[PDB]
Amino acid sequence: PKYEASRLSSLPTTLDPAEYDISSETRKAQAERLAIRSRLKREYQLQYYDPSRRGVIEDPALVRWTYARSANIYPNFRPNTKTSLLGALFGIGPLVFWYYVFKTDRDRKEKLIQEGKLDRTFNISY
Amino acid sequence: MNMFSSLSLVTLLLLTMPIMMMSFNTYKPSNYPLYVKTAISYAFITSMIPTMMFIH
Amino acid sequence: AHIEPRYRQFPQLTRSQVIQAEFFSATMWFWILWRFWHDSDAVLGHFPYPDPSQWTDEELGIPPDDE
Amino acid sequence: MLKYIIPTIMLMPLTWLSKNNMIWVNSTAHSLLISFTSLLLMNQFGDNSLNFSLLFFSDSLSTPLLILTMWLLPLMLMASQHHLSKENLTRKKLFITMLISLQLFLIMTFTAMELILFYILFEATLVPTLIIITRWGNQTERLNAGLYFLFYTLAGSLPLLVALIYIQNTVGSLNFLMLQYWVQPVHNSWSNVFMWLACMMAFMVKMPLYGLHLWLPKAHVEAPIAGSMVLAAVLLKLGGYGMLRITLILNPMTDFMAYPFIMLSLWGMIMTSSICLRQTDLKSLIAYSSVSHMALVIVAILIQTPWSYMGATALMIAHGLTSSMLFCLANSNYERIHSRTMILARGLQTLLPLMATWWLLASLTNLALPPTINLIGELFVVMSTFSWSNITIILMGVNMVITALYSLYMLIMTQRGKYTYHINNISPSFTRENALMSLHILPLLLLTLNPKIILGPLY
Amino acid sequence: YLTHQQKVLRLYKRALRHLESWCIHRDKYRYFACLLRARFDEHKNEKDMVKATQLLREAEEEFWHGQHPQPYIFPESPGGTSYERYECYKVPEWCLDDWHPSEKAMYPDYFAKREQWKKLRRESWEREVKQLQEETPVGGPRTEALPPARKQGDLPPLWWHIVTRPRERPM
Amino acid sequence: ITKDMLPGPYPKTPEERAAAAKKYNMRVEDYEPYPDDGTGYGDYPKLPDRSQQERDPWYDWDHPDLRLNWGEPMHWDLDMYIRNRVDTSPTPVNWNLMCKHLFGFVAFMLFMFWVGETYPAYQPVGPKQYPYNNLYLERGGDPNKEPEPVVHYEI
Amino acid sequence: GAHLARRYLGDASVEPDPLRMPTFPPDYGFPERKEREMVATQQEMNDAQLVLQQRDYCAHYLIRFLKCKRDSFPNFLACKHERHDWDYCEHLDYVKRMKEFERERRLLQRKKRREQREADM
Amino acid sequence: SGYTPEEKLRLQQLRELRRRWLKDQELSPREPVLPPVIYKTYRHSIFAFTHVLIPVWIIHYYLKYHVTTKPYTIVEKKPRIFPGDTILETGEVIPPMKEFPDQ
Amino acid sequence: KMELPDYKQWKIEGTPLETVQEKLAARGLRDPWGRNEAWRYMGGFANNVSFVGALLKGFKWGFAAFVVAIGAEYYLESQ
Amino acid sequence: PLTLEGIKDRVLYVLKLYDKIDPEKLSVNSHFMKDLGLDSLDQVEIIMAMEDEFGFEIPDIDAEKLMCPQEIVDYIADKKDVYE
Numbered sequence A: 001p002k003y004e005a006s007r008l009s010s011l012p013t014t015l016d017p018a019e020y021d022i023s024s025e026t027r028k029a030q031a032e033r034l035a036i037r038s039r040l041k042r043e044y045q046l047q048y049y050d051p052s053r054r055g056v057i058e059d060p061a062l063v064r065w066t067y068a069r070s071a072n073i074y075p076n077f078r079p080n081t082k083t084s085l086l087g088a089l090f091g092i093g094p095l096v097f098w099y100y101v102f103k104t105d106r107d108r109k110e111k112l113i114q115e116g117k118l119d120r121t122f123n124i125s126y
Numbered sequence B: 001m002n003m004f005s006s007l008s009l010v011t012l013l014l015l016t017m018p019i020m021m022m023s024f025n026t027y028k029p030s031n032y033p034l035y036v037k038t039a040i041s042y043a044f045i046t047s048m049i050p051t052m053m054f055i056h
Numbered sequence C: 001a002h003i004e005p006r007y008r009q010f011p012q013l014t015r016s017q018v019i020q021a022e023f024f025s026a027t028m029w030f031w032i033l034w035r036f037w038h039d040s041d042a043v044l045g046h047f048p049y050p051d052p053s054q055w056t057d058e059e060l061g062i063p064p065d066d067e
Numbered sequence D: 001m002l003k004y005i006i007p008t009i010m011l012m013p014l015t016w017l018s019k020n021n022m023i024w025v026n027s028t029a030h031s032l033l034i035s036f037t038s039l040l041l042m043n044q045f046g047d048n049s050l051n052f053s054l055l056f057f058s059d060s061l062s063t064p065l066l067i068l069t070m071w072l073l074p075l076m077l078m079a080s081q082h083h084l085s086k087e088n089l090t091r092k093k094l095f096i097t098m099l100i101s102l103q104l105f106l107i108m109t110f111t112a113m114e115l116i117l118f119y120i121l122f123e124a125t126l127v128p129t130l131i132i133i134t135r136w137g138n139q140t141e142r143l144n145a146g147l148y149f150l151f152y153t154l155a156g157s158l159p160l161l162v163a164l165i166y167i168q169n170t171v172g173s174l175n176f177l178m179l180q181y182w183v184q185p186v187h188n189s190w191s192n193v194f195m196w197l198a199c200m201m202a203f204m205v206k207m208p209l210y211g212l213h214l215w216l217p218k219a220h221v222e223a224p225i226a227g228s229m230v231l232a233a234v235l236l237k238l239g240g241y242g243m244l245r246i247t248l249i250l251n252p253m254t255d256f257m258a259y260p261f262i263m264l265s266l267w268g269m270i271m272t273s274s275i276c277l278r279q280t281d282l283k284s285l286i287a288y289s290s291v292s293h294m295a296l297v298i299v300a301i302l303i304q305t306p307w308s309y310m311g312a313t314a315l316m317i318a319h320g321l322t323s324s325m326l327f328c329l330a331n332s333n334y335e336r337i338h339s340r341t342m343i344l345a346r347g348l349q350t351l352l353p354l355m356a357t358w359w360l361l362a363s364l365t366n367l368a369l370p371p372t373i374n375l376i377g378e379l380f381v382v383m384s385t386f387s388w389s390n391i392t393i394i395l396m397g398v399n400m401v402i403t404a405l406y407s408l409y410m411l412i413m414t415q416r417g418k419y420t421y422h423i424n425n426i427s428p429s430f431t432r433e434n435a436l437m438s439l440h441i442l443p444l445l446l447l448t449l450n451p452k453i454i455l456g457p458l459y
Numbered sequence E: 001y002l003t004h005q006q007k008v009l010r011l012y013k014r015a016l017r018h019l020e021s022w023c024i025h026r027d028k029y030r031y032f033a034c035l036l037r038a039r040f041d042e043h044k045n046e047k048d049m050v051k052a053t054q055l056l057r058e059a060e061e062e063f064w065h066g067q068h069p070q071p072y073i074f075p076e077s078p079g080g081t082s083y084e085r086y087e088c089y090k091v092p093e094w095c096l097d098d099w100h101p102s103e104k105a106m107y108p109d110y111f112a113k114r115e116q117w118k119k120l121r122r123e124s125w126e127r128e129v130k131q132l133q134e135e136t137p138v139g140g141p142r143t144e145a146l147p148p149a150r151k152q153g154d155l156p157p158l159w160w161h162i163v164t165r166p167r168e169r170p171m
Numbered sequence F: 001i002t003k004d005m006l007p008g009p010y011p012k013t014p015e016e017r018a019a020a021a022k023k024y025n026m027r028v029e030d031y032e033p034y035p036d037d038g039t040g041y042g043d044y045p046k047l048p049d050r051s052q053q054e055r056d057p058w059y060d061w062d063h064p065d066l067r068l069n070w071g072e073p074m075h076w077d078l079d080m081y082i083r084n085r086v087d088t089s090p091t092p093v094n095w096n097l098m099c100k101h102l103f104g105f106v107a108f109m110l111f112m113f114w115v116g117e118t119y120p121a122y123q124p125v126g127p128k129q130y131p132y133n134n135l136y137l138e139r140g141g142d143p144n145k146e147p148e149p150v151v152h153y154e155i
Numbered sequence G: 001g002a003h004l005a006r007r008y009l010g011d012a013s014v015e016p017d018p019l020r021m022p023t024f025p026p027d028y029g030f031p032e033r034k035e036r037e038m039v040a041t042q043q044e045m046n047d048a049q050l051v052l053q054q055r056d057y058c059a060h061y062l063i064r065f066l067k068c069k070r071d072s073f074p075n076f077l078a079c080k081h082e083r084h085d086w087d088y089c090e091h092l093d094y095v096k097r098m099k100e101f102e103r104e105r106r107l108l109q110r111k112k113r114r115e116q117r118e119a120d121m
Numbered sequence H: 001s002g003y004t005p006e007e008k009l010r011l012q013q014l015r016e017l018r019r020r021w022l023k024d025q026e027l028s029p030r031e032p033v034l035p036p037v038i039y040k041t042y043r044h045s046i047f048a049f050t051h052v053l054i055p056v057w058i059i060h061y062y063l064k065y066h067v068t069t070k071p072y073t074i075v076e077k078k079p080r081i082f083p084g085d086t087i088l089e090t091g092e093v094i095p096p097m098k099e100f101p102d103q
Numbered sequence I: 001k002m003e004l005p006d007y008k009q010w011k012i013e014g015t016p017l018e019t020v021q022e023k024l025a026a027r028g029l030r031d032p033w034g035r036n037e038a039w040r041y042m043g044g045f046a047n048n049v050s051f052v053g054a055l056l057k058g059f060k061w062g063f064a065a066f067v068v069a070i071g072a073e074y075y076l077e078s079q
Numbered sequence J: 001p002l003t004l005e006g007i008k009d010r011v012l013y014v015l016k017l018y019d020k021i022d023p024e025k026l027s028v029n030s031h032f033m034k035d036l037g038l039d040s041l042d043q044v045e046i047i048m049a050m051e052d053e054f055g056f057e058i059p060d061i062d063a064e065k066l067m068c069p070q071e072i073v074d075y076i077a078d079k080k081d082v083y084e
């Protein structure tokens, strides 16, 4: 039985065929990624350990994230087939669905009341 | 009725008292846990009176 | 404290914990034996269960076939 | 109402003639005195409203809104004096004058007997509010927040002006007491459909109705703290107050004209509650939470039942204190770390224990823990909408779940977990901040003892 | 990132801990731990890297099949029942700077010794920054490793938050 | 924070791609934007869709609770993947098999409950008998009317 | 047990229906059948405030037991004999229900057996 | 797979500092400098007086003179009456039951 | 401060660890950590009750206290 | 309430019940490979025995570096805030 990875259950690293095969090109990339991490760690630590620093160390990564999650969306939005189809299937469809659910229920109940068939014996709070 | 209804309500009021004291009206941090435990024990006793009347 | 930790050895016990534990264990077994001696019906049933196949057709009011 | 209008006006000379270092002490002390005297409006009778003159009247709907309005002014002053400490004296006095003039317009708006007088004061509130946001907001986007706020409002309010003037020509009067006796039914026709829309769209934008709400998260994220407090606590309730009055003259057309707006609100409340689960900005999360809460008020006002009208009034008052308190809580963090990102500063309960208690109580009211008036108002609306249609209990119930999830997500994210290591300027809470939080929650929880005074005229 | 030897030894440790979760009893575990060791010893001297990598991959597939679904976890380890239990009691040292004077007056001796540490931190900072500058390659640090102090009287660069970190049981 | 250090539009040319990778502190070979549909991602990197729980707990993270380092690009859905929310960790059992066994168990129980309701268990006894016309008055029957006489006989 | 296998796995036409029984007249094969005697009156059970499910043909023993319990308080181990008498009356009441079930079954069997005689003829 | 000569040296240097810091967390003898059976029964008698007796006086006064003066505030289930009982109010005697058959 | 019992007293002889040592010796293998587990099999840990014995804890005295009680009850039953 | 000498006493106690180690050669500074002749699989087993002894986990990245009894003592003392 082989592992069947899913969206919510990742493939274990120890079962990933890529890991056991490491070429020199891969090891170059791994070293290059550690260089970036070390450069950022130093830049963070020289402020974190500064005895005269009282405040928040601004993280441009965090600023970029909050900016992207709001301000940058519309400028890079294009109205194509996908945006309108999603836009109309989840921005007007639910309203139509609920209108018919509630309109159908209320018309059925209004008809019953007008014929005196809905039981409202003790119903005097509304 | 006068004993039954009075004791059944003192049980509940007794439980709230350690909460109210914690508004520093009369504050004894030294052994607050012992205070809370003692209140539960007294509430248990006073609740057994209306219970006995019901069983009777 | 009154009880000191030990290394790789059975712990130090007090008499009070050992005796109180034995009292409540024997109390349980006396209570079960005492209750069973008196209330075995609570375990084995309170009344006989009749065998319906042993009831005559006279008392059940079953008439003979030729009727 | 002159006994409230005139002393409110006098707060202006008091501020301008105060010693330089006493502008905050003086204006706070005397605005608290005015708030005290506002309790005299609680002389409400079982049958008749309290009708002072040909211009102003007070009933069980406007009375709580007035007391909340006059209570907020001293709170707003306390909330604003720290970030305004470097401002020069004349501009501080100007900032206070804008707050005083807002109170003047608001108390007059809630008691105006005539609907066109209500309209003029209802629009006059735009000017000081816009000035507060665009002049004393902090970031570049406050200029666009001012424009969105201004033009959304006017886009709906100008049709209202035409409809109100038309009504006065047709009926002869816009006096609300006269409209109660001279009101005539509205017959189906395309003309009356647009009269209905003109009468209601301006108030729908103020609530705001889902779909017309995008201005609100803009305004809050850019507004100063006092701007957010009045916007959330009181200005949103102008729309609800206007709807509660204008619906009188729109029957029976509201029976079917309500449907599209009930669907937007019923579905909108779920959408905006779910959006709160993913917001990264603390002020934006609270602003979106108001849209969800006011969706209930719109539904209650539109289905037009005694229980729903009582629930709407309790909800409007309860949301005002709760939402304002949440903004003040978020602002106290902002004055330390100078960011609105919710994930930036975590585990704050370890550093600010008492402030974490205010966060807990504000969250508990926001998710409407019984017997808070937040729950009383929300429960009344749920009771009334179930009779309107049993299926609505599914949407109302689902929204209750999501509301608890995002309220406690806000609490767990900022107060719990591990504190951010590099943030080392979390100074202990000030008396001013602790007092500010307690002046929100204490009146809110006290009102549970006597809910009838915030249940409105249908009580 | 992990060498072949590193991967094998992590697998050995991981397999033994999961084996122990299955066995529970010490005499049973000692028996099967020695059989498992003998399986790793069967290929200790395998010199062909391609053959050795094949063994490692199959061992990891065999581990995944036979792993305990609920392995034992040390209580304070990640995922353990006591993991992060005491984080709420860990207050950073800078909080003491904001104490009221009447609060500091209750610990005169502790706060006198704290001033010396802050004095030591202030006077040492510039040398630590200088040392890090002169020992860091031109492009920038290639690893997260930090150097010791080279001179007498110097403190290892970036020491304050390691040395003054909260105690593991701070209350 | 300058405008050049903020998210921008989708990168069209390789030169823009290299600039985006540097802005986000990533290798140019690792950087990859979201597809240029109209959804508004811009040039924000598409990082692996993994929970923060999947990250190594022993590494000295700058943010140990989030398991993030200062300056590293944050996943677009970082707030969803915090350790208090959606977990994507590998599971001892395959996801598809877990769904089959869970669904199968629930479906089987529901079927058997329907069977048990269709063929209920009961004892071999006749109806319980009550006096006074099956307690007509006690149950709330109208005193004025007359119930049909319920009669129970000895046996 | 056994009775359920016969109905669900065997012939169900000759088995009693617990929800419809009895389906034969109470005077069938029973000349001069006597009515059950209720000892406690309606007012006695109404004043004793018996739960409605308890107001059956054994209610008089339950009333006597309940009176003893109140009178013997705090001695809560008394009234054993009064309790047993109520328990025993309920056992006989249950045995009578068991006989009605067996009577219905044997009449159903007798009927089907008579139809074969007619079906054969 | 062991420490390098510089890892050993840094770890040793931080070790010395960390242990000196921990030693400095101990309190001096004077710290904190603070600003300036019959007992068992007495402490339990005073607890009962203030947590039981006073509350029961307050509640009994409240129930007797404020709650039970208004209709239907305290509603009781009426007492059970059995055959052979005597009603206190009227003196009426409830008859015994019809005689039981043998069993 | 703390006194550790002499490490030489830990011997696998006479314990189930000796059984493992014979089962491994048949295969040519040998267990090096045996004496590290020997304390768990010696001393106050040497012999523990079975499951039945754990349930019957206190049965001896509960039975005697019961034989007396019923005996006393019978004696009074004849007076 | 561990002490520096207490940690050392138990680290050596465990190693003296290890049949692959000569109890007379063992000292605090004995290198597991250079001085005691063990291999890297033995080293893993030793670290696991130290985790069992003190009841906490030493991560593999840190564990692979502990090559003598003294280094284990220093690691445990540092992890448990033992300064005396």
Ligand SMILES: CCCCCCCCCCCCO[C@@H]1O[C@H](CO)[C@@H](O[C@H]2O[C@H](CO)[C@@H](O)[C@H](O)[C@H]2O)[C@H](O)[C@H]1O
Residues within 6 Å of the ligand: B013, B021, B026, B027, B028, B029, B030, B031, B032, B033, B034, B035, B036, B038, H046, H047, H050, H051, H054, H055, H058
């Ligand atoms: C609406 C009803 C209100 C009723 C008001 C009654 C007022 C009575 C005032 C009593 C004040 C007692 O104040 C509170 O009592 C407890 C117990 O007695 C005391 O607490 C003390 O005694 C308890 C005894 O178990 C111990 O925990 C410990 O010795 C100490 O904490 C303190 O003194 C104080 O915490």
Ligand SMILES: CCCCCCCCCCCCO[C@@H]1O[C@H](CO)[C@@H](O[C@H]2O[C@H](CO)[C@@H](O)[C@H](O)[C@H]2O)[C@H](O)[C@H]1O
Residues within 6 Å of the ligand: D016, D017, D018, D019, D020
């Ligand atoms: C013909 C009809 C005209 C009607 C005019 C009626 C009002 C006339 C007022 C004249 C006196 C005004 O006095 C002038 O204003 C302010 C307010 O007191 C004074 O000084 C002020 O300084 C600061 C703020 O300004 C405050 O401490 C305080 O408000 C006051 O002391 C000036 O030093 C004085 O020159």
Ligand SMILES: CCCCCCCCCCCCO[C@@H]1O[C@H](CO)[C@@H](O[C@H]2O[C@H](CO)[C@@H](O)[C@H](O)[C@H]2O)[C@H](O)[C@H]1O
Residues within 6 Å of the ligand: A074, A075, D144, D147, D148, D151, D152, D153, D155, D156, D212
């Ligand atoms: C539904 C009833 C109410 C509807 C009211 C709608 C009328 C418009 C209200 C806002 C008016 C603001 O006026 C103008 O609007 C546009 C977008 O709308 C803003 O434009 C903003 O987004 C565009 C692209 O989306 C950018 O190119 C621009 O840099 C930015 O400023 C302007 O900055 C603002 O000056």
Ligand SMILES: CCCCCCCCCCCCO[C@@H]1O[C@H](CO)[C@@H](O[C@H]2O[C@H](CO)[C@@H](O)[C@H](O)[C@H]2O)[C@H](O)[C@H]1O
Residues within 6 Å of the ligand: D188, D189, D190, D193, D257, D260
């Ligand atoms: C968020 C946006 C919400 C938008 C909500 C839209 C509501 C739509 C309401 C539809 C009903 C409009 O009002 C309806 O118009 C029709 C004309 O078409 C009127 O019809 C009237 O004139 C026509 C002329 O042909 C006659 O045949 C008819 O006998 C007469 O009733 C009705 O008197 C009125 O009932």
Ligand SMILES: CCCCCCCCCCCCO[C@@H]1O[C@H](CO)[C@@H](O[C@H]2O[C@H](CO)[C@@H](O)[C@H](O)[C@H]2O)[C@H](O)[C@H]1O
Residues within 6 Å of the ligand: F097, F100, F101, F104, F105, F108
């Ligand atoms: C007292 C308790 C009473 C209730 C007990 C209810 C238990 C009922 C369990 C029903 C669910 C069984 O579900 C069934 O499991 C087996 C076992 O893998 C699966 O079987 C299949 O999957 C496995 C694993 O991938 C493969 O070897 C192969 O493809 C096949 O065997 C079926 O695909 C699945 O449908």
Ligand SMILES: *C(=O)CCCCCCCCCCCCC
Residues within 6 Å of the ligand: F119, F120, F121, F122, F123, F124, G001, G002, G003, G004, G005, G008
């Ligand atoms: C006879 O009275 C049977 C009582 C119930 C037995 C339950 C034991 C398990 C399931 C068997 C019930 C039979 C369903 C037809």
